[PDB]
Amino acid sequence: ISVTTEILPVSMTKTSVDCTMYICGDSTECSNLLLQYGSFCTQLKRAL
Amino acid sequence: KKSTNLVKNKCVNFNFNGLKGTGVLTESNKKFLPFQQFGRDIADTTDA
């Protein structure tokens, strides 16, 4: 009578990202400049 | 230029010798050397 071990992954860690903090940070001028590019943030948020 | 009193433990704007930023200032336990002025983190942003 033998006993064997098998290991299988199931889940994965969940992450969230912020656009303005990563790209611009603590500068308002960069935010006002970045407001005129598009809506990539919506796509990133939806995927995550 | 002018000068102003130092406030701590409140989110404020600071201009240290031309270095502009927004954040909260705290007493530090770090030890510097006579030829050093500030430190940096992994992403080359000032922390001390």
Curated annotation (Swiss-Prot), chain B:
Superkingdom of the organism of origin: Viruses
Region (Disordered): 1-14
Function (record text): Attaches the virion to the cell membrane by interacting with host receptor, initiating the infection. The major receptor is host ACE2. When S2/S2' has been cleaved, binding to the receptor triggers direct fusion at the cell membrane. When S2/S2' has not been cleaved, binding to the receptor results in internalization of the virus by endocytosis using host TFRC and GRM2 and leading to fusion of the virion membrane with the host endosomal membrane. Alternatively, may use NRP1/NRP2 and integrin as entry receptors.
Subunit structure: Binds to host ACE2. RBD also interacts with the N-linked glycan on 'Asn-90' of ACE2. Cleavage of S generates a polybasic C-terminal sequence on S1 that binds to host Neuropilin-1 (NRP1) and Neuropilin-2 (NRP2) receptors. Interacts with host integrin alpha-5/beta-1 (ITGA5:ITGB1) and with ACE2 in complex with integrin alpha-5/beta-1 (ITGA5:ITGB1). May interact via cytoplasmic c-terminus with M protein. May interact (via N-terminus) with host bilirubin and biliverdin, thereby preventing antibody binding to the SARS-CoV-2 spike NTD via an allosteric mechanism.
Record protein name field: Spike protein S1
Lineage, opening ranks: Viruses, Riboviria, Orthornavirae, Pisuviricota, Pisoniviricetes
